Curated annotation (Swiss-Prot), chain A:
Protein name, UniProt field: SPI-1 type 3 secretion system pilotin
Main location: membrane
Membrane association type: Lipid-anchor
Residue numbers of the full-length protein present here: 70 to 147 of 147
GO terms for cellular component: cell outer membrane
Assigned protein family: Belongs to the InvH family.
From Swiss-Prot, chain B:
Biological role stated in the UniProt entry: Component of the type III secretion system (T3SS), also called injectisome, which is used to inject bacterial effector proteins into eukaryotic host cells. Forms a ring-shaped multimeric structure with an apparent central pore in the outer membrane.
Family: Belongs to the bacterial secretin family. T3SS SctC subfamily.
Disruption phenotype: Insertion mutants are hypoinvasive in the HEp-2 cell assay.
Subunit structure: The core secretion machinery of the T3SS is composed of approximately 20 different proteins, including cytoplasmic components, a base, an export apparatus and a needle. This subunit is part of the base, which anchors the injectisome in the bacterial cell envelope. Forms a stable homooligomeric complex. The complex is composed of 15 subunits.
Subcellular location: Cell outer membrane
Lineage: Bacteria, Pseudomonadati, Pseudomonadota, Gammaproteobacteria, Enterobacterales
Boundaries of the shown chain within the full protein: 520 to 562 of 562
Species of the source: Salmonella typhimurium (strain LT2 / SGSC1412 / ATCC 700720)
Protein name as annotated: SPI-1 type 3 secretion system secretin
Length: 79, 45
């Protein structure tokens, strides 16, 4: 896509922001390693909706992104 | 004699169609991350 943009801003003052790196990596990794979307369009959907509800459900929103996805995943395949 | 009732309906109403704007490639994971940072404390960029 001509005239594209990737960067956002050169304001690296808060560490929480840098987290975007680790988080993004964990996402692409889990998406590439386990592309549920490619397995079942319905699967990825349920995982998404639940992944968003499981993020607001808990009060410890300041938790590691690893737990959010981890819980959202295991919960998706819960009996 | 009087009227039965006062019916309602559109009046000089207008509307604008807006079918455009989409993502791809990064949006796949972006959605997840965006939600994590959006639910965590606040957006970031």
């Amino acid at each position: 896509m001509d005239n594209s943009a990737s960067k956002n801003s050169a304001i690296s003052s808060s560490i929480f922001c840098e987290k975007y790196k680790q988080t993004k990596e964990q996402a692409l990794t889990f998406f590439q390693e386990h592309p549920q979307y490619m397995r079942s369009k319905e699967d990825e959907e349920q995982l998404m909706t639940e992944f968003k509800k499981v993020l607001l459900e808990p009060g410890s929103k300041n938790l590691s992104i690893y737990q959010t996805l981890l819980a959202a995943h295991e919960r998706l395949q819960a009996l | 004699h009087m009227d039965p009732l006062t019916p309602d309906a559109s009046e000089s109403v207008n509307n604008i169609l807006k079918q455009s704007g989409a993502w791809s490639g990064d949006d796949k994971l972006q959605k997840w991350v965006r939600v994590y940072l959006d639910r965590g404390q606040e957006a970031i960029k």
